[model samples]
Target: HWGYGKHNGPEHWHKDFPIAKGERQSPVDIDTHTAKYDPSLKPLSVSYDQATSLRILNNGHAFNVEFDDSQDKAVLKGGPLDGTYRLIQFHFHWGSLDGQGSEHTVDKKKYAAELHLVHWNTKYGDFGKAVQQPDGLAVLGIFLKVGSAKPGLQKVVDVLDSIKTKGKSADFTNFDPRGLLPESLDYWTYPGSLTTPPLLECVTWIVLKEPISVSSEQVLKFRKLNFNGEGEPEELMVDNWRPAQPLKNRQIKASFK
Candidate 1:
């Protein structure tokens, strides 16, 4: 089974999932100096319906909130995207302690944590099939720094205890994914891949440059999630993030100048 343990971690992934070493892997270190300003990129168009939310689960790797993508109620458009994409789910990646998490960093600076809003290109019909196509997915990355307590995020944190172990899940609905974003939606877009295993090169990563506030203690609450399932040896779900991959020959376009 693929995981973040010493044997299955990012370094060991290439042996099992060859695509991990592919051309456009995600979670790249964003060098703002090298990021080009694309005046042509449009602002992100996100329509996330609260009722689209379904459930929250540990998922053995990260805590994910799955959404109902039956229609366009929670669809995404604009930005670096060419067509519409439907929301599938959103999840978070964090560290055991503060200031050591985050997948994509800016100028080599890591945030306390990061939130990923996963969406699939509607052109492909469904996430199962879309995940394999080169232009199939669009993931929005939001950096979470230690500061004020994010009110909207607290609603998500309140349910953490209910899903404290891997494979555990609880009904979760009426949560707006938009509340998790910073006021400024400015972002950097580039072709990338899933940061986790099966690391397919299909995602169009739209990483927000502005980080939202998250209290230091809330980050600790995320660590309470167990990577192990019931009766298994305890493994805290910290550092579940994959390290940044080589940029190769890709160019990151900033929405702002």
Candidate 2:
């Protein structure tokens, strides 16, 4: 059971998941002064149908809202992407306290939380196979701030109580994933890996520059989620994010100046 505990945390994941120490790992710190602003970058195109939302499940690490990606019901195109990528699921990472749970940092500053909307390249057939190739996945990273409760996120927050324990799941449908985004599509992009296990270097990260706001109370609700299943010692899920990795030789492109 790989977890964020002291003995089995990110620092120790490399022992089991060899790719944890890979060169192109995600959640890197973004140095904007060196990030190139490319006007040639096209606007990001996200089309998600509310009806495509299937269910919400507690994967013990986080609560993921799964989608029916068998069809092109929801897709992400343009931006730095080639062809189309189908939406698979979206999850989040946050701290037990306000101001520091995001995986990626900007100029060494961490946000209150981060949301990852995972997508798989249809060109690769399925997510499982796609994850092994360099151009297989696209993750939209949306940073969250503590403020008024986000109306767009109310539907997601309302179900947290049901999934407070690990392995618990509930039907979640007809919700527009777009409502959770900020007004600006302005973003930064780079090649990276999944912040979790397998840490495959297959993701083209599209991180939004503007942040969406959520209430402090809402953040505490996320902290209440248990990392352990029934009959296990309750472990409050918090600080589940991986620390930012080295940038190495990667070039981060900005869609806006």
Task: Give per-model TM-scores.
Answer: 0.97, 0.98
183 in model 1: Cα distance from truth in Å? 0.3
Query: Each candidate: what lDDT?
Result: 0.90, 0.91
**lDDT value, residue 49 of candidate 2:** 62
lDDT of 2 by residue, 114-206 (tens): 999999999989999999999999999999999988998989988988988889999998988988989999999999999999788999999
Q: What are the per-residue Cα lDDT tens digits for candidate 1 across 141-169?
A: 99999999999898899999999898999
After superposition, the stretches of candidate 2 with alpha carbons farther than 4 Å from their true spots are none
Listed per candidate, the RMSD to the true structure in angstroms reads: 1.0, 1.0
